[PDB]
């Protein structure tokens, strides 16, 4: 009754990437029990961004479809919600660090995101805007030290046909005691469905579903 079959969200992000300061404000909506969501984002400070939008898109776990037999840590955390901290280590030394708060206010999810990105090479695909969206990912979720930890090897498509990899670690922490699942996998596909000419208005789509592992966690 706390999380309805349809839920909206608002997101505010503040960040710096290689020293470039920016802010994003957005609104999203989706069906949390179906693993479907969309969002429309606006760059409100620092636009147009001089780097690939794709590094920001993975910066909304309440909208993961969980089978009944896998406890849903994220949904169970509400109304209080949860928080997360993440490091994304890109293969060329680029690094993004993130904090996030997820709350429920006035019947919608509220996401506050703070991030810092550094060491993206000036001639690399992020600063040269040569990326073309993320391949589908498998986030391996593990209960550890009283939290849920996620690990991902993520692959960003490049305009030239190759891929640019990021090793991701996240700690997700509920704001109250919640039943922890065993270790499991969240399958994720995120698309940038539309954008204006300078990526100051961007729309995203994401589908996510939890599953049991088959081969070793």
Q: Residue 171: phi, psi to the nearest 5?
A: -115, 125
**What is the domain-level CATH number for residue 212?**
2.40.155.10
Residues in the chain: 217
Q: What is the resolution of this structure in A?
A: 1.3
Q: Is 83 exposed, middle or buried (0-12, 13-18, 19+ CB in 10 A)?
A: middle
Binding-site residue set: 69, 135, 144-145, 151, 163, 195, 212
Could you give the 3-state DSSP secondary structure of residue 22? strand
Experimental technique: X-ray
Residue-number span of the structural domain to which 106 is assigned: 1-217
- The total number of structural domains in the chain stands at 1
In DSSP terms, which residues pair with 205 in a beta bridge? 38, 191
Q: Are 117 and 129 in contact (CB under 8 A)?
A: no
Binding residues for Zn(2+): 69, 135, 144-145, 151, 163, 195, 212
User: Which sign, positive or negative, has the C-alpha torsion 76, 138, 85, 148?
Assistant: positive
């Amino acid at each position: 009754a706390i999380i309805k079959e349809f839920m909206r969200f608002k997101v505010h992000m503040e960040g710096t990437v290689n020293g470039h300061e920016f802010e994003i404000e957005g609104e999203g909506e989706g069906h949390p029990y179906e693993g479907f969501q969309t969002a429309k984002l606006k760059v409100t400070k620092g636009g147009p961004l001089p780097f690939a939008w794709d590094i920001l898109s993975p910066l909304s776990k309440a909208y993961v479809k969980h089978p009944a037999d896998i406890p849903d840590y994220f949904k169970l955390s509400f109304p209080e919600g949860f928080k997360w901290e993440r490091v994304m280590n890109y293969e060329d030394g680029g690094v993004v660090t993130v904090t996030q708060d997820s709350s429920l206010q006035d019947g919608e999810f509220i996401y506050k995101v703070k991030m810092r990105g550094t060491n993206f090479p000036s001639d690399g695909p992020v600063m040269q805007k040569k990326t073309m969206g993320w391949e589908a990912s498998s986030e391996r979720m593990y209960p550890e030290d009283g939290a849920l930890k996620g690990e991902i090897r993520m692959r960003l498509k490049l305009k030239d046909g190759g891929h640019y990899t990021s090793e991701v670690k996240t700690t997700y922490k509920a704001k109250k005691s919640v039943l922890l699942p065993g270790a499991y996998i969240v399958g994720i596909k995120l698309d940038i469905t539309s954008h204006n000419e300078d990526y100051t208005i961007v729309e995203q789509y994401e589908r996510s579903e939890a599953r049991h592992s088959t081969g070793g966690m």
